[PDB]
């Protein structure tokens, strides 16, 4: 059977692998990028920085000693978008800087903390399930685990940027209201540049949120 739990720091490399295998190759934002679909090292560093914070949840096939799902979340709070823009100005790759600006825009537009009267919120950055492990409620169990965990940790709200139809469906199912959205192909940075071209046109990102 399948175990859900928080990833340990000593498991950073396994987290890295699952991200390489099932997340990046499919993530709408990363693969729709105009100058190359591959993820960069600074992207990876961002995602893995959460393992030490104890907010990376993995779904593990204990019988195969193998990760088969992962969810990465962290706190967000007023000020974060501006800090992200600053980080974008200094990061190693242009791709990660551009993505960081997009994420910042998503967060700024959603304004979860301001809309709900919070000092901070818990934000799911990544939710990824190996698609060959169907029929086990994996996506729902990962998201629910993140909800339960953030609750215990004292968070008053949880949110996420959901890039796929499934994932939005889960969010809605588990009581999250989509409060903001952004058509990916319509995105333009401050230069006026179109940076994302989802092979699936009319691909939309939805920021959803729920009080805990």
Alpha-carbon gap, residue 192 to 209, rounded angstroms: 29
Q: Experimentally, how was this structure solved? A: X-ray
Q: Are 25 and 128 in contact (CB under 8 A)?
A: no
Residue 202: count other Cβ atoms within 10 Å of its Cβ.
Answer: 9
192 φψ region: left (φ > 0), alpha (ψ -120 to 50), beta (else): left
Looking at the structure of the chain, the number of domains it has is 1
Entry resolution in angstroms? 2.0
Q: Classify the C-alpha dihedral 1-161-36-90 as positive or negative.
A: negative
Q: Classify the C-alpha dihedral 108-12-54-86 as positive or negative.
A: negative
Q: In the chain, which residues are followed by a C-to-N distance beyond 2.5 Å, i.e. a gap? A: none
User: Hey, what's the torsion of the CAs at 151, 153, 158, 159, to 10 degrees?
Assistant: -150
Find the CATH number of the domain harbouring 86.
3.40.630.30
**SS3 (DSSP) at 87:** helix
Domain hosting 22: range is 1-212
Helix ranges restricted to H, the chain:
12-18, 28-31, 41-48, 80-90, 94-110, 112-116, 138-153, 165-173
């Amino acid at each position: 059977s399948i175990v859900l739990r928080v990833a340990r720091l000593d498991e950073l490399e396994q987290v890295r692998e699952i991200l390489h295998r099932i997340y990046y190759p499919e993530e709408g934002i990363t693969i729709s990028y105009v100058h190359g679909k591959s993820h960069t090292l600074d992207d990876e560093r961002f995602s893995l920085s959460f393992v030490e914070q104890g907010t990376v949840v993995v779904a593990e096939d204990s019988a195969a000693k193998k990760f088969i799902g992962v969810s990465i979340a962290g706190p967000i709070q007023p000020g974060d978008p501006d800090a992200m823009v600053e980080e974008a100005a200094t990061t190693e790759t242009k791709k990660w800087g551009d993505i960081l600006k997009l994420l910042a825009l998503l967060e700024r537009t959603a304004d979860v903390c301001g809309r709900y009267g919070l000092e901070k919120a818990y934000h799911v950055h990544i939710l990824a399930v190996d698609p060959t492990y169907r029929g086990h409620s994996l996506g729902q169990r990962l998201l629910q685990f993140q909800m339960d965990l953030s609750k215990k940790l004292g968070f008053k709200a949880i949110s996420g940027d959901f890039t796929s139809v499934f994932s939005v469906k889960l969010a809605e199912k588990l009581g999250m209201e989509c409060i903001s959205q952004l058509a990916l192909g319509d995105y333009r940075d401050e230069k006026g540049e179109k940076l994302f071209e989802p092979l699936d046109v009319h691909q939309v990102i939805k920021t959803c949120v729920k009080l805990l």
